Design an enzyme around this catalytic site. Structure first.
Site, PDB file in Angstrom:
ATOM      1  N   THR A 154      -0.572  33.226 -12.307  1.00 56.83           N
ATOM      2  CA  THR A 154       0.629  33.405 -11.487  1.00 56.83           C
ATOM      3  C   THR A 154       1.847  32.935 -12.280  1.00 56.83           C
ATOM      4  O   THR A 154       2.920  33.538 -12.185  1.00 56.83           O
ATOM      5  CB  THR A 154       0.469  32.662 -10.145  1.00 56.83           C
ATOM      6  OG1 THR A 154      -0.092  31.367 -10.382  1.00 56.83           O
ATOM      7  CG2 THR A 154      -0.412  33.421  -9.157  1.00 56.83           C
ATOM      8  N   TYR A 155       1.653  31.864 -13.080  1.00 58.46           N
ATOM      9  CA  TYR A 155       2.635  31.236 -13.972  1.00 58.46           C
ATOM     10  C   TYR A 155       3.107  32.204 -15.075  1.00 58.46           C
ATOM     11  O   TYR A 155       4.287  32.207 -15.435  1.00 58.46           O
ATOM     12  CB  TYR A 155       2.041  29.942 -14.591  1.00 58.46           C
ATOM     13  CG  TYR A 155       0.727  30.112 -15.337  1.00 58.46           C
ATOM     14  CD1 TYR A 155       0.706  30.368 -16.705  1.00 58.46           C
ATOM     15  CD2 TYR A 155      -0.494  29.954 -14.687  1.00 58.46           C
ATOM     16  CE1 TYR A 155      -0.494  30.514 -17.400  1.00 58.46           C
ATOM     17  CE2 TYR A 155      -1.704  30.094 -15.372  1.00 58.46           C
ATOM     18  CZ  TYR A 155      -1.698  30.367 -16.731  1.00 58.46           C
ATOM     19  OH  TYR A 155      -2.877  30.496 -17.429  1.00 58.46           O
ATOM     20  N   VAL A 211      -5.100  33.882 -24.285  1.00 58.53           N
ATOM     21  CA  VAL A 211      -6.161  32.919 -23.978  1.00 58.53           C
ATOM     22  C   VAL A 211      -6.186  32.543 -22.495  1.00 58.53           C
ATOM     23  O   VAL A 211      -7.221  32.117 -21.981  1.00 58.53           O
ATOM     24  CB  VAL A 211      -6.114  31.672 -24.903  1.00 58.53           C
ATOM     25  CG1 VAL A 211      -6.576  32.013 -26.318  1.00 58.53           C
ATOM     26  CG2 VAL A 211      -4.731  31.018 -24.913  1.00 58.53           C
ATOM     27  N   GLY A 212      -5.046  32.708 -21.833  1.00 55.80           N
ATOM     28  CA  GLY A 212      -4.870  32.401 -20.422  1.00 55.80           C
ATOM     29  C   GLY A 212      -4.064  33.445 -19.686  1.00 55.80           C
ATOM     30  O   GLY A 212      -3.279  34.175 -20.298  1.00 55.80           O
ATOM     31  N   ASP A 232       0.909  21.455  -7.526  1.00 53.84           N
ATOM     32  CA  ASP A 232      -0.324  22.226  -7.654  1.00 53.84           C
ATOM     33  C   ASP A 232      -1.214  21.719  -8.784  1.00 53.84           C
ATOM     34  O   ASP A 232      -1.419  22.427  -9.756  1.00 53.84           O
ATOM     35  CB  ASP A 232      -0.030  23.745  -7.778  1.00 53.84           C
ATOM     36  CG  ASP A 232      -1.257  24.652  -7.806  1.00 53.84           C
ATOM     37  OD1 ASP A 232      -2.185  24.435  -6.987  1.00 53.84           O
ATOM     38  OD2 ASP A 232      -1.293  25.571  -8.649  1.00 53.84           O
ATOM     39  N   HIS A 275       1.364  34.424 -18.811  1.00 53.66           N
ATOM     40  CA  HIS A 275       0.304  34.564 -19.812  1.00 53.66           C
ATOM     41  C   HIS A 275       0.487  33.542 -20.935  1.00 53.66           C
ATOM     42  O   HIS A 275       1.621  33.200 -21.269  1.00 53.66           O
ATOM     43  CB  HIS A 275       0.299  35.990 -20.394  1.00 53.66           C
ATOM     44  CG  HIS A 275       0.355  37.069 -19.358  1.00 53.66           C
ATOM     45  ND1 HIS A 275      -0.799  37.615 -18.820  1.00 53.66           N
ATOM     46  CD2 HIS A 275       1.429  37.655 -18.778  1.00 53.66           C
ATOM     47  CE1 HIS A 275      -0.394  38.518 -17.941  1.00 53.66           C
ATOM     48  NE2 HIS A 275       0.938  38.577 -17.880  1.00 53.66           N
TER      49      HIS A 275
HETATM   50  C1  LIG Z   1      -8.463  34.045 -15.749  1.00 51.98           C
HETATM   51  N1  LIG Z   1      -9.044  33.035 -16.635  1.00 51.98           N
HETATM   52  C2  LIG Z   1     -10.503  32.958 -16.588  1.00 51.98           C
HETATM   53  C3  LIG Z   1      -8.280  32.250 -17.419  1.00 51.98           C
HETATM   54  O1  LIG Z   1      -7.060  32.339 -17.427  1.00 51.98           O
HETATM   55  C4  LIG Z   1      -8.984  31.222 -18.304  1.00 51.98           C
HETATM   56  N2  LIG Z   1      -8.129  30.077 -18.569  1.00 51.98           N
HETATM   57  C5  LIG Z   1      -7.294  29.913 -19.608  1.00 51.98           C
HETATM   58  C6  LIG Z   1      -6.669  28.700 -19.435  1.00 51.98           C
HETATM   59  C7  LIG Z   1      -5.666  28.036 -20.314  1.00 51.98           C
HETATM   60  C8  LIG Z   1      -5.089  28.717 -21.389  1.00 51.98           C
HETATM   61  C9  LIG Z   1      -4.165  28.090 -22.213  1.00 51.98           C
HETATM   62  C10 LIG Z   1      -3.785  26.765 -21.989  1.00 51.98           C
HETATM   63  C11 LIG Z   1      -2.780  26.088 -22.855  1.00 51.98           C
HETATM   64  C12 LIG Z   1      -3.178  25.522 -24.066  1.00 51.98           C
HETATM   65  N3  LIG Z   1      -2.375  24.824 -24.885  1.00 51.98           N
HETATM   66  C13 LIG Z   1      -1.128  24.603 -24.486  1.00 51.98           C
HETATM   67  C14 LIG Z   1      -0.573  25.119 -23.285  1.00 51.98           C
HETATM   68  C15 LIG Z   1       0.765  24.876 -22.878  1.00 51.98           C
HETATM   69  C16 LIG Z   1       1.234  25.374 -21.692  1.00 51.98           C
HETATM   70  C17 LIG Z   1       0.404  26.109 -20.856  1.00 51.98           C
HETATM   71  C18 LIG Z   1      -0.903  26.342 -21.199  1.00 51.98           C
HETATM   72  C19 LIG Z   1      -1.439  25.853 -22.425  1.00 51.98           C
HETATM   73  C20 LIG Z   1      -4.369  26.089 -20.915  1.00 51.98           C
HETATM   74  C21 LIG Z   1      -5.284  26.713 -20.086  1.00 51.98           C
HETATM   75  C22 LIG Z   1      -7.231  28.193 -18.245  1.00 51.98           C
HETATM   76  N4  LIG Z   1      -8.103  29.026 -17.715  1.00 51.98           N
END
Ligand SMILES: CN(C)C(=O)Cn1cc(-c2ccc(-c3cncc4ccccc34)cc2)cn1
EC number: 2.7.11.22
Lengths: 329, 264
Positions: free
Chosen positions: A32-33, A28-29, A145, A35
């Site tokens: 740099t941190y 979903v994300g 950040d 995935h």
């Molecule tokens: C390149 N693009 C367009 C992207 O990455 C699009 N994106 C995705 C995100 C994102 C995805 C997951 C979480 C998350 C959710 N719940 C719990 C969490 C615990 C620790 C870290 C993250 C979470 C937060 C944000 C932001 N932006």
């Protein structure tokens, strides 16, 4: 080197991320941190959504170390809660487990500016950002950040509307002007400037210091800060002379260029009254001089949070969430 | 990081009972005596101290590495992982936690090889046998078996706050700080809160330097019974120091120590 019976016992008893959760093709994300995946428990004990953060690289990096170390100690309703750590011995990858936050400010802002934000929700979001950062600052922990993508908002469930500050360790829209002028150290005021940047973005749907894409000096980003804020007068920031990039600033810029530039004029164009309590708090957060910038505790005490409406524990305030669920990358 | 100790993983999980510690130790006490075991702990404390000195690490990094080592062997046998591999691994992990950076592969192995060769030749006739793949493996086990408790609180910070409150930061601080470094030859960091170790060290420092700190100590409202318990351990540690010849005894104590068993 290591006892066989010790290694064997630990391998038999070690919980592996792939055995406990289903996350294949659930990314979903990305960043740099590392995935992030929207995972479900393989053992049907819970139907809850969980976030699995696979860290960038092999072994335990500085960012992985800093995140594990701090999240293990930090307990706050507005700071993301580390539930478990998986050390995948096979590929030497580090996995972090948290409860899944359906939303973030990056997606919430994106949805609103695509249409072209309820004011009660903006106030509630900001009070929870200031609350979470005040706790971190009280434990001498700096975010370093802060950006909308880090300010997670919980979806439907027992924690609906709760803000969660995530990530502990390209775009300088949220970087304080002293960083852009060569300030070597990270400070509490650097986090405060970022919150001010976020608050302006929640009020207008646009990044206040939006800039087109390894030194600390970024001319284009400083230029955008001065087009919004105006060039700082000597009286406004006396230690600007002490900045490592001050001679460069004097060489590249001229005070005259930003003569008709002020935060009042910027915010007025985006329909935010300069006599409103929201504007006055924003101007205290967005102060060029870091020593003249308000603290998180002083910001939380602002009469803005006493004005109608009061901030709520659920930022959505029981109203139906219009924002779509995160798409699987 | 500088949070409340009462809400820390250090207090809630790594402040142990003196009897739980002794019971877990009984596994190694079949091979070594109670005397030989505390000598071996002093030895490795001094090994981690020599490693940190060589790498030019601050006392806080050295102390965090010491607490990791002590914490691991409080739950596990000296045969589970070789302490000769655990000592530089702890130093490597603590340098990352304490924000001192990642010690490079070539810098860490050379530091371990040189320190043992030039400072511990009496106990080690052979060169440091481990490589970076061994450190990186041990690191994963160390992080796992500490329940990912990386933030460690030390007596150095409250001690500096106490001496500054006394107005004797110049007279007492050098000796009290030295006494704190010496507590790492004992299990105090696994049994008592850091501020308590700092008060007992400051008390011993006042006694040695002959200073009336009775008034200041009486206006603390701390459990003086527990401070007296630490004082006795500090006093005992110097008598242990007198009768222990590390250089003459360690080769035999390391031979008696249980070693890791290989696969069949
Ligand atoms: C390149 N693009 C367009 C992207 O990455 C699009 N994106 C995705 C995100 C994102 C995805 C997951 C979480 C998350 C959710 N719940 C719990 C969490 C615990 C620790 C870290 C993250 C979470 C937060 C944000 C932001 N932006």
């Amino acid at each position: 080197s290591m006892d066989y019976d010790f290694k064997v016992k630990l391998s038999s008893e070690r919980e592996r991320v792939e055995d406990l959760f289903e996350y294949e093709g659930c990314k979903v994300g990305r960043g740099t941190y590392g995935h992030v995946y929207k995972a479900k428990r393989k053992d049907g004990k819970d139907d809850k959504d969980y976030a699995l953060k696979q860290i960038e690289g092999t072994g335990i990096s500085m960012s992985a170390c800093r995140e594990i170390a701090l999240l293990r100690e930090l307990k706050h309703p507005n700071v993301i809660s580390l539930q478990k750590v998986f050390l995948s011995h096979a590929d030497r990858k580090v996995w972090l487990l948290f409860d899944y936050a359906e939303h973030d400010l990056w997606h919430i802002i994106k949805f609103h500016r695509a249409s072209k934000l309820p004011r009660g929700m903006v106030k509630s979001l900001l009070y929870q950002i200031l609350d979470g950062i005040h706790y971190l600052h009280a434990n001498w922990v700096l975010h370093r950040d802060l950006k909308p993508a880090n300010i997670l908002v919980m979806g439907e469930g027992p924690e609906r509307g709760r803000v969660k500050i995530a990530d502990m360790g390209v775009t300088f829209w949220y970087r304080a002007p002293e960083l852009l002028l060569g300030a070597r150290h990270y400070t509490k005021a650097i986090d405060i400037w970022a919150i001010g940047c976020i608050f302006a973005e929640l009020l207008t749907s646009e990044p206040i210091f939006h800039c087109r894409q390894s030194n600390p000096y970024h001319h284009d980003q400083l230029d955008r800060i001065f087009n919004v804020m105006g060039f700082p007068a000597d009286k406004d920031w006396e230690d600007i002379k002490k900045m490592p990039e001050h001679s460069t600033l004097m060489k590249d810029f001229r005070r005259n260029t930003y003569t008709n530039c002020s935060l009042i004029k910027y915010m007025e164009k985006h329909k935010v009254k300069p006599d409103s309590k929201a504007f006055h708090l924003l101007q205290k957060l967005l102060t060029m001089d870091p020593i003249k910038r308000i603290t998180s505790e002083q910001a939380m005490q602002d009469p803005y949070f006493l004005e109608d409406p009061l901030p709520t524990s659920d930022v959505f305030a029981g109203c139906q969430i219009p924002y779509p669920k995160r798409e699987f990358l | 990081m500088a949070g409340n100790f009462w809400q820390s993983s250090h207090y809630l999980q790594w402040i142990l009972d003196k009897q739980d510690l002794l019971k877990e130790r009984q596994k190694d006490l079949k091979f070594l005596s109670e005397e030989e075991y505390w000598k071996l702990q002093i030895f490795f404390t001094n090994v981690i101290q020599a490693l940190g000195e060589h790498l030019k690490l601050r006392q806080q990094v050295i102390a965090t590495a010491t607490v990791y080592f002590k914490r691991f062997y409080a739950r596990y046998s000296l045969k589970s992982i070789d302490p000769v591999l655990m000592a530089p691994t702890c130093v490597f992990l603590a340098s990352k936690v304490e924000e001192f950076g990642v010690v490079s592969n070539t810098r860490l192995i050379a530091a371990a090889t040189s320190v043992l060769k030039t400072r511990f030749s009496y106990a080690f006739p052979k060169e440091f046998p481990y490589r970076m793949n061994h450190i990186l493996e041990c690191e994963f086990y160390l992080l796992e078996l500490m329940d990912c408790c990386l933030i460690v609180y030390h007596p150095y910070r409250p001690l500096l706050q106490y001496v500054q409150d006394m107005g004797q930061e110049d007279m007492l601080l050098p000796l009290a700080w030295r006494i704190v470094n010496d507590t790492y030859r004992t299990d105090l960091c696994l049994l008592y809160p850091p501020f308590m170790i700092a008060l007992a060290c400051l008390h011993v420092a006042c006694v040695v330097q002959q200073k009336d700190a009775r008034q200041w100590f009486a206006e603390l409202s701390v459990d003086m019974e527990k401070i007296l318990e630490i004082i006795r351990v500090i006093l005992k540690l110097y008598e242990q120091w007198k009768n222990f010849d590390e250089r003459k005894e360690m080769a035999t104590i390391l031979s008696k120590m249980p070693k890791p068993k290989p696969p069949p």
